[PDB]
């Protein structure tokens, strides 16, 4: 990491590491919540993107690898390329930041893709867990706005946010892209806007996204499209907070897995016949966290599976010294994307030495504290499917 603050106030975060592949991009505090509905932000930024790269033929001819992550509270764009493609890479990024609205033909093509997102493999089980946690565990109901429209509802271009991007952009890149990005940042507005955005508070809501899943998803006849997802969410800590290493450890204590070994694997997948998978994640937001446990099982088995998760919670109290350390071991592992993700949040990157230190540098003490404060909350309960969420809820009293 190399942090500059440019002549015009724009920040620049450069990644350390050996040369060969060039990286540029922009991160900004605009996410899916800064538009009135699901996919509005997603389809908007997409439209801007495809226009900024002129054509897919241009992207191909220059062998540029673009990646756009739109989250609830913030978004980032990353381009990857070989040095001979710098000119086009920069120019394209400059176009993304210029604030102009895209043509409507572009927007229509882009919403077509968005409606088709599950069929094309763009709306996997990971993206569903997020949505469920986000439509269930927040007091502010606009966190329910995701990136992927329901077959029914509408999508609308949001111009405001395109004018807003240059006004709150931090630029990012590999160290070899310093002078190119300093020039780029220079051409932007002095000086960046500052807005107080805090993550919305926890609320243990009980919701359903009772929606049909496409049989074919990408190139797979999905093995899970007839099963339901149960997302149980509790509050944790922000990305920065001193508790985050223990919380990461705690997620791996829980762990998970499929078929086609930790607590959720042995207790929850083994315990429920026709349960494809279960996973725990510690998901971070601008100023908070959601610890979530996700179960993909038959609709009829969720209440059963919920009980087995409560057993799992109780088993953490008397965890053996082996696994309080094996879960420290399971926190060991797109290198640029983590650089950008961590940079916005303020945390240490998952690849860095300092972070892998933090893992060893927290014991049973800080783990127990974390388990204690988290599960002393009633869970948010979401279901992808028909299952009545209050039935699952009653499991936790």
């Amino acid at each position: 990491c190399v942090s500059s603050v440019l002549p015009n106030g724009i920040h620049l975060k450069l990644m350390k590491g050996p040369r060969g592949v060039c990286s540029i991009g922009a991160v900004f505090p605009i996410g899916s919540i800064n538009s009135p509905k699901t996919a509005d932000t997603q389809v908007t930024l997409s439209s801007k993107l495809v226009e900024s790269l002129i054509s897919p033929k241009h992207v191909f001819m220059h062998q540029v690898y673009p990646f756009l992550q739109v989250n609830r509270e913030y978004s980032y764009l990353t381009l990857q390329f070989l040095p001979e493609s710098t000119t086009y890479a920069i120019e394209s990024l400059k176009r993304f930041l210029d604030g102009a609205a895209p043509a409507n033909t572009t927007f229509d093509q882009q919403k077509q893709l968005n409606y088709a997102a599950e069929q094309l493999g763009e709306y996997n089980l990971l993206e569903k867990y997020k949505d469920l946690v986000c439509m269930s565990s927040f007091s502010n109901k606009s966190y329910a706005h995701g990136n992927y429209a329901l077959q029914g509802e509408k999508i609308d271009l949001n111009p405001q946010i395109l004018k807003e991007i240059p006004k709150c952009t931090t630029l990012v890149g590999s160290i070899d892209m310093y002078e190119e990005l300093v020039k780029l940042g220079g051409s932007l507005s002095p000086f960046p806007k500052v807005k107080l955005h805090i993550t919305s508070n926890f609320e243990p809501n009980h919701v359903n996204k009772n929606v049909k899943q496409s049989s074919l998803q990408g190139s797979k006849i999905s093995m899970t499209s007839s099963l339901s997802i149960m997302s149980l969410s509790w509050p944790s800590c922000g990305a920065k907070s001193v508790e985050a290493p223990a919380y990461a450890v705690l997620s791996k204590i829980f762990g998970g897995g499929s078929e086609f070994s930790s607590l959720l694997y042995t207790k929850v997948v083994g315990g429920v016949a026709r349960c494809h998978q279960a996973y725990a994640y510690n998901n971070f937001f601008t100023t908070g966290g959601r610890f979530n446990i996700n179960v993909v099982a038959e609709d009829r088995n969720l209440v059963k599976a919920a009980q087995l998760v409560r057993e799992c919670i109780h088993s953490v109290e008397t965890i053996e010294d082996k696994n309080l350390d094996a879960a420290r071991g399971l926190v060991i592992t797109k290198r640029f994307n983590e650089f950008v993700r961590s940079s916005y949040l303020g945390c240490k990157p998952i690849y860095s030495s300092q972070y892998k230190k933090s893992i060893k540098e927290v014991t049973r003490k800080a783990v127990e504290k974390a388990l204690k404060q988290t599960f002393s909350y009633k869970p948010a309960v979401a279901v992808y499917g028909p299952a009545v969420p209050n039935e699952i809820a009653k499991v936790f009293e």
């Binding site: 592949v21 540029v64 049989s215 190139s219 006849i221 086609f260 082996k322 696994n323 094996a326 071991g329």
Partner: protein
């Protein structure tokens, strides 16, 4: 990252060759690369190479299944394996301190297995499971169907084997394959590392102290000329109504062998058609709205297959095929040949310089390079050949391989 480097090879007195290439960082990928795979099988034993791979990772004498699990969780030793049509490897990617433990676990399992009738039979269901899983990726299904109708010879077998074949695999068969394919003379020990060539050579020496030299060298069962492939272009259509208003399509041509002067040319041609991603499609594709496109070209002994595939709605299926055939055609056009050469060449440079800061990737190429090439080929000297490749080379490839050839084709449809 690496530095257009060249590997150091020493042979131990027990005949194990240790090959190391210098890297930067606290990363090390190391393991055994073995010329074993489904190219070397027949009707009677199809799937045995993959099957054996599995058994190997289900523990031996010194490290049974339990001791392996402990090493995963507690000791930071994580073990990966894969079986292709042409090669097999067993490896770990590690922190430089675990070297001695890792060389020992890896040597012990690969070179010193304990292949019981019990481990064999227990494992059967875990493999049939993998088979059903992979049968639900229709890209994998079509990829296999294309090989099957193209090659009456062994390359047309699926890596895992037919269901029938996964059923009938005996312990004697698994045993036999290890005996005939897992010897010092048919394999390499590969390390991509910052540690000097000698620290690895000393550590492997330690790990393989139980292994006695080979008495003689019977002609290796992996030898390409024992498994001559024959491409014959075929057309075959299949149903899968479960798919709905969707069809999958593959188009195949014979490809050059790895050592052919027309290998690189072929790789440039495949690459210029290339893949369709979210934001990126080939300049040769007239209809940019086509749902999905994948391009691959792989060498198999004397032969090889170049394949183009995707899915579309029943309605757009026929269109997809014309699109692809058109795009291929355009490459040969004098107005476009030169631009098709440069963009294709750029692609191949892009592809490779993208797997130069992953040491797993470096090790996989180093393994395959050593197992598959007359003699070794370095990135820089590859890059020379790529840059020396001309318009005449592309034409010459088009002549032997594309112009006036029948294509293999597979359609899997919902109607």
């Amino acid at each position: 990252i690496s530095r257009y480097a060249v590997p150091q090879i020493s042979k131990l007195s027990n005949g194990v060759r240790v090959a190391t290439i210098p890297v930067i960082g606290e990363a090390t990928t190391l393991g055994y690369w073995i010329k074993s795979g489904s190219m070397y099988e027949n009707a009677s034993n199809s799937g045995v190479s993959h099957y054996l791979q599995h058994v190997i990772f289900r523990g031996n004498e010194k490290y049974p299944q339990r001791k392996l699990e402990q090493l995963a969780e507690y000791e930071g030793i994580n073990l990966m394996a894969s079986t292709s049509r042409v090669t097999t490897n067993f490896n770990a990617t590690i922190s430089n301190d675990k070297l001695d433990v890792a060389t020992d676990v890896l040597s012990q399992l690969v070179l010193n297995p304990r292949i019981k009738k019990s481990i064999v039979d227990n494992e059967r269901d875990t493999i049939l499971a993998e088979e059903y899983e992979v049968s639900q990726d229709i890209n994998e299904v079509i990829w296999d169907k294309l090989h099957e109708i193209s090659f009456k010879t062994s390359i047309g077998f699926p890596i895992l084997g037919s269901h029938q074949s996964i059923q009938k695999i005996t312990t004697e068969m698994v045993q036999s394959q290890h005996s005939n394919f897992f010897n010092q003379d048919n394999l390499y020990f590969v390390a991509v590392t910052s540690l000097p060539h000698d620290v690895i050579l000393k550590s492997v020496e330690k790990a393989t102290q139980f292994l006695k030299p080979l008495a003689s060298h019977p002609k290796l069962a992996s030898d390409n000329d024992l498994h001559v492939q024959k491409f014959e272009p075929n057309q075959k259509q299949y149903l899968l109504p479960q798919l709905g208003d969707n069809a999958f399509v593959a188009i195949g041509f014979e490809a050059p062998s790895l050592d052919s002067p027309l290998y690189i040319p072929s790789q440039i041609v495949k690459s210029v058609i290339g893949s369709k991603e979210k934001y990126s499609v080939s300049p040769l594709i007239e209809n940019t709205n086509i749902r999905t496109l994948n391009s691959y070209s792989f060498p198999y002994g004397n032969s090889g297959l170049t394949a183009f595939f995707g899915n579309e709605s029943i309605n757009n299926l026929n269109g997809w095929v014309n699109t692809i055939f058109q795009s291929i055609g355009t490459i040969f056009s004098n107005e476009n040949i030169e631009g098709s050469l440069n963009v294709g060449r750029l692609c191949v440079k892009s592809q490779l310089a993208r797997g130069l800061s992953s040491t797993r990737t470096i090790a996989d190429e180093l393994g395959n390079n050593l197992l598959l090439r007359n003699e070794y080929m370095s990135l820089g000297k590859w890059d020379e050949l790529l840059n020396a490749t001309n318009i005449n080379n592309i034409k010459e490839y088009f002549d032997k391989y594309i112009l006036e050839k029948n294509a293999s084709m597979v359609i899997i449809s919902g109607k």
